[PDB]
């Protein structure tokens, strides 16, 4: 009841924040935002 | 014999004339594009990244 509600909300919170949302594992953006010298792909992973 | 020959040969040449005439009306624009693309043909490719 009480703990059931708390646990339910915590479960949804964990399942939602833990969603591996698409991060910047992208070529496109830098590919056509950083016009630099040609190479394969250089994700600015600094 | 000769009558069939002249009539048939005349029809042959007439249809040949039709062929070339319509081809003139439908292909005469190619040389322009040919000259264009001949000027564009300068191609050389070396993939620097490869």
> Which experimental method was this entry solved with?
cryo-EM
For A19-42, letters b (16+ CB in 10 Å) and e give eeeeeeeeeeeeeeeeeeeeeeee
Q: How far apart are CA A46 and CA B47, in angstroms?
A: 27
Residue A32, phi-psi category: left (phi > 0), alpha (psi -120 to 50), beta (remainder)? alpha
Given in angstroms, what resolution was this structure solved at?
Answer: 4.5
Instruction: Confirm if A30 and A44 have CB atoms less than 8 A apart.
Output: yes
Instruction: Confirm if B48 and A38 have CB atoms less than 8 A apart.
Output: yes
Instruction: Confirm if A36 and A44 have CB atoms less than 8 A apart.
Output: no
Tokens of B38: 């001949």
Residues of B in contact with A38 (CB under 8 A): 48-49
Residues of A in contact with B49 (CB under 8 A): 38-40
Residue of B nearest to A40 (CA): B49
């Amino acid at each position: 009841l009480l703990s059931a509600h708390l646990e339910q909300i915590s479960i949804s919170c964990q399942g939602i924040d833990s969603l591996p949302f698409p991060p910047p594992k992208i070529f496109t953006n830098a590919l056509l935002s950083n016009p630099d010298i040609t190479s394969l792909i250089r994700d600015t992973e600094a | 014999s000769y009558a069939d020959c002249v009539c048939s040969l005349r029809t042959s040449l007439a249809f040949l004339e039709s062929s070339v005439a319509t081809l003139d009306n439908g292909v005469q624009d190619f040389p322009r594009l040919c000259h264009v693309l001949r000027t564009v043909r300068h191609y050389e490719l070396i993939p620097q990244t490869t």
